[PDB]
Amino acid sequence: RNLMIVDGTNLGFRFKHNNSKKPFASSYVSTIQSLAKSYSARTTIVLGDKGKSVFRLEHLPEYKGNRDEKYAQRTEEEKALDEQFFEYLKDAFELCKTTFPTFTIRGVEADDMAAYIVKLIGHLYDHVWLISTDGDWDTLLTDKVSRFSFTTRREYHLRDMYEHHNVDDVEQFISLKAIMGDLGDNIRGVEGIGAKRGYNIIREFGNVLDIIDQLPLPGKQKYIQNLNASEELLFRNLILVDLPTYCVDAIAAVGQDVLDKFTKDILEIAE
Ligand SMILES: [Zn+2]
């Protein structure tokens, strides 16, 4: 029997993209019942997001400050549609409450909880299935932990780290994010360095903490020059992207008590 951790808000947004008018709460859970059946999910855990990441906002005050700007310039109809979605989502998460253990810790991101659960109980199962279209969740991939994106109807395994992410492992994917950047979450990257360039640098010099040791790096390229002055940016981004290493801190940032209850609840389910 396997473990299934769903990315609630993420799946919800997929139901929005398919249709912004029609409610989805019913299909949502049913779809999750189908997936659990297929992946012999003996245990199923639904997780959604609730608020900005307290842990991230600390190391980067402007973290995700771009998604706010986008809502500021939305018309009445747009903000309306947006509000609808979030309503239908709240309903969707309520429906789940009747079938699957659901969780929402305001101030903690979903990936932070999924990563904490994976660590905490991942060993109690034969496999762990992450249900998300978000490839950032691929930082949890192991030979016993895999992801499944509906948008592509494809499942992603560790061996697929290069084709899908331009890197070779979980540590390189973290270093690439920290070096490259992440527009979607509004995280500044080394100006001039992208996926292909970032990889090559990593392949030749190693992970971030290894590249910091070697700065300045040889080369007369501007991105190689920009790199040599991003040390501060690198240390920062690394914390924001290194999910498996900072997930316990990310949750504890909202209370040594909230972390305790969530720990108790998980194991109280994986038993
Ligand atoms: Zn997420």
From Swiss-Prot:
Mg(2+) 2 binds at residues 111, 134, 136. One of its GO terms (molecular function) is metal ion binding. K(+) binds at residues 190, 193. DNA binds at residue 64. Its cofactor is Mg(2+); K(+). This is Flap endonuclease. Optimum pH is 9.3 for the exonuclease activity, 5.5 for endonuclease activity. High pH favors the exonuclease activity whereas low pH favors the endonuclease activity. One of its GO terms (biological process) is DNA replication, Okazaki fragment processing. Changing residue 14 to A: 10 fold increase in the dissociation constant for pseudo-Y binding. 3 fold increase in the dissociation constant for 5'overhangs binding. InterPro entries: 5-3_exonucl_a-hlix_arch_N (IPR020046), 5-3_exonuclease (IPR002421), 5-3_exonuclease_C_sf (IPR036279), DNA_polI_H3TH (IPR020045), FEN (IPR038969), FEN_D15-like (IPR043666), HhH2 (IPR008918), PIN-like_dom_sf (IPR029060). The keyword Magnesium applies. Its EC number is 3.1.11.-, 3.1.11.3. It comes from Escherichia phage T5 (Enterobacteria phage T5). It catalyses: Exonucleolytic cleavage in the 5'- to 3'-direction to yield nucleoside 5'-phosphates.
